[model samples]
Target: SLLPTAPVRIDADLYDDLANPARQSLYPRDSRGFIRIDISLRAYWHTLFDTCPRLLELSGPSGGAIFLPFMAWARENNLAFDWSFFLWVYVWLQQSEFRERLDEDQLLPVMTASATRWLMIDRDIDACQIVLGSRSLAGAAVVGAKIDSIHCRLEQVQQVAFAAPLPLPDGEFGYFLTPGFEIDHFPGWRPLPR
Candidate 1:
């Protein structure tokens, strides 16, 4: 109920500064406490952008529609990583047609590094189990689902899911939204040889 009864839509494109005035105002104080009310799609997304325009390439209305609320909730509880990182994971969950249209092909392991960097992420369950990006638990699930998946059998890794209403947690977690963690062994995955 913290969000406005209606979603406040913005006219600008995804690249615009969608910062909520309130989110900017209280950051130097107890602002973190009231983030839920300020949760809007682009507002949180814009804050993570560097001048490099690091995020525009990951754009997709469909993916955002399903998961940006989780992003906001993730931030409110200190579980979210850089917006582009989630952006990478978000569009990545979509099938090839979606990526072909959006051109989002960021690598996962590197992105996983950012999420685990400032946080003390650990394995929450069996090393072979994964939350597979639907939002719940905490850092451990993110690390479990992603980092471990790098070397494990794609067929053996368990995919964990939450039923109905998605979840946010008291600790860091991965909820990249509806994407399975299966991929080629991710070592040296990008910057392909010329």
Candidate 2:
């Protein structure tokens, strides 16, 4: 189910900085791996800010109860994007509803752009998909279902189990956690192998 809270907002300056590829070089060597992470994080918050009508209507406790479980599900399944800091930032932005409310009407459009940008720019799956998928998988597991259908959907794409870039031997392969691929129309994904 969609989150009941209002979407988070973003600062223009922070958004601009994240959008700048050059700014990535300014980070520490290890952190340099997160250039796309920054952009995705910004986009995540921006999408929330642009979506969600429940903004400012829900209490912090309510949001936390829902959001934390979602995060835990993603982490447990190794569904997080390579950029941990960005993920942290994305979560942090939603901690408050003191900012602008989401433009509800623009929710899907913003989500699409955000999802696409994460794929094209960061070449990653929609973080939301990972959250939802992992959550559903966990739910199914709780009920002892084989979930072969979900597993089948996941088999159609490349898997990355580690930090390494995915192999594109046959054609270009990228990771994005959305329901389906937007580019080559391929299906499925997994973490980089260790």
Candidate 3:
């Protein structure tokens, strides 16, 4: 049986403040002050399979096929199976407009590019922290400008990140992006470290 729960109340303005793309200042931080990460697809998979095995039954016989190539690619590239990059790709698959527009051949490159962009952003965030610590006000302003530029670039990356969905077999719905675990969700959920 589903767990019983109380009504979850939310403050609209507070929600908006957290949701706004321009307001990254409000993002959640860890004890060390780094941003809390969104959960990865692999992590979610384990969570769901452990807590809700019945949900997997709904995916049909061919459901597992959709993710094999992705798993292989991750292994080949030394990429972690549970990364936000894969989660983003899974979320893209949920979009009806872009779903079915691409094949495995077309999809792999997009996944690679998206993952690379994520790495670049991670690098930029690290660089920003270092620069912010070492520089004077004038120097920091230049770094701030670069951070803004990177944010704009990240916005663009997000626009096309999910341009097409995964090619799942007929009758299977593939993966889903959950509410509390998504990258942009309030109180950002960071992927677990490898």
Candidate 4:
């Protein structure tokens, strides 16, 4: 389940450094030299559960609750939303160890472009596929099901968007894909192409 047996190591100094908006150099960058955006892990989780209720209801093997209500407080006020952060959190939840380690308030630097590159080059999977697959896999495991069941669940969410190739941007590709949710905030940000 989502229960934590031992506390994960967190470097206070590193956490503070990333949390500071003035510290830009520490941000993760892509091969094309575009700096990825950073967001508060706490705020992200809150908005995620609030905006996507299905994720909030997800329970683990031992029936421990995955998210707390306090995490969603910021969403009531209407804050900036980043889907890449949402995707990153979904991927993080796939591994049980990560669920325990990811601090609530830590700053998460999302290298969406770099991550997209890795998925395309190393894994042969596109960003859309990864997000959809991660959600499907995580949903299955939340019910204490075997990992092998992910294949069947994943196929259900797979769509024509997965077939389209990503464009190699000169510097930054401002848009990201999140098929699961509909949001309107960042002008450059967009959902997965239909």
Candidate 5:
């Protein structure tokens, strides 16, 4: 029998205001940007699995909660092709190291959970990347126009001061233009130019 599990708690602080509307607008004031984060803890997995008898039979509740929802969301949102999946997989897989804490009996279950969670994380990241990419294209619409020009200049200044040292060996510095401002501008650059 499965023990009662609580919903997954996603700390809002992990993301910047851009992703969280209540905190601060990550996108331009005129732009319409929205991001939804669905965190699935053990409880969420249990609940979803219980509802879907077929899914439960296949991968159990944990699998549905951890993977099905992500796939569903991706298809619904048309984010199945986004590039963020790469980074998402990398980051999500990193959590596997935490599995060492599980006992022999819990090993398979935990591993299954981890796999599903990794898929969700990857899908979610892909969705997020889609959002960021769309927002970027929206932001870039007026390339050298008044509002964008101003923002770009300000960002350029910030980049030089805090962003620093040209990531690529070629020293190409047009980093200001890209998707996911938080990832591109905040994290120091990883080259996701599209």
Candidate 6:
């Protein structure tokens, strides 16, 4: 039986204040100039497989991986997973205080980055590359990104981060990736620059 799943769609205006530099005085910002996250509801994978019936069916198994179909569905529908999929990495990047703040606000904090060749932590080989490599249970097409020196933003999410080792304990697939941000960018679908 499928659980009740909230519909996942990218809400560009969710952080409308951040996009407008002049209006965001109250929001805390990091040294790099991105919003210092204080809160986030941090939605996970339920919304994802829920959207795609086939993927939802596939999600039933430990061997349930949908990379090959993930690509097709994402590209065709112009929808992608949320960046929250990478919440695992942020478990370390973000301090517990900040995480506590997110819990306080009842909002899921979209984690931040340092932009060091460290994303290249494989860093230039990059977190995105790591996500793609992990797409299947030895199989499928999936991908990952980051942006800028002034502020690193992997804002335009490509692939779903289906398999980070740990950092998320409330996960359904104790073995699969903890869960990700859900694709929240791609307001207007455009390919990542090569």
Worst lDDT window (10 residues) for model 5? 137-146
**What would the per-residue lDDT of candidate 6 be over residues 1-194, giving only the tens digit for each residue?**
43221221234433443223233344334322222211221112333333223323323432124332333334444432333233332232233223333331121112221112113333333123213221111222133333434675545324344342323223211112112324332222222211
State TM-scores per candidate: 0.25, 0.24, 0.22, 0.24, 0.19, 0.18
lDDT of 2 by residue, 1-194 (tens): 43221222334324444433344455544443343446554564444433443432432424443244434544545453443323222233344343243232222232233333333334333232321111111111000111225446532222223233233322111123444322233244432221
- C-alpha lDDT of candidate 6 relative to the true structure: 0.28
Model 5 over residues 1-194: C-alpha lDDT tens digits?
43222222243533332222233233333322222223223333443344333433334434633354344443444443232432222222234433233232332232233223333444332222211111112122111111223345341112112233333312211122223333344333333322
Q: What ranking emerges by lDDT with the best candidate at the front?
A: 1, 2, 4, 3, 5, 6
Of the two candidates 3 and 6, the one with more favorable TM-score, higher being better, is 3
Return the candidate ranking by TM-score, descending. Answer: 1, 4, 2, 3, 5, 6
- For model 5, what is the C-alpha lDDT against the true structure? 0.30
lDDT of 1 by residue, 88-183 (tens): 333333433334432212433323433443223433343322233322232222333434335755433233332443444322223332134443
- Model 3: weakest 10-residue lDDT segment is 130-139
Point out the worst 10-residue segment of candidate 2 by lDDT: 136-145
Please identify model 4 stretches exceeding 4 Å from their true place. Answer: 1-42, 60-82, 97-194
Range of the 10 consecutive residues with the lowest summed lDDT in candidate 1: 185-194
RMSD of each: 15.8, 17.1, 19.6, 18.9, 19.3, 20.0
lDDT string for model 4 (1-194, tens) is: 33221222344424443323344344444311112214454444444554444444344332224432212322333323333444444433544444544332221222222233333343322223233222222111110111224345442222223333333322222234432233222223233221
- Whole-model Cα lDDT of every candidate shown, in order: 0.35, 0.33, 0.31, 0.32, 0.30, 0.28
Pick by TM-score: 4 or 6, better one: 4
Give residue 142's error in model 6 in angstroms. 11
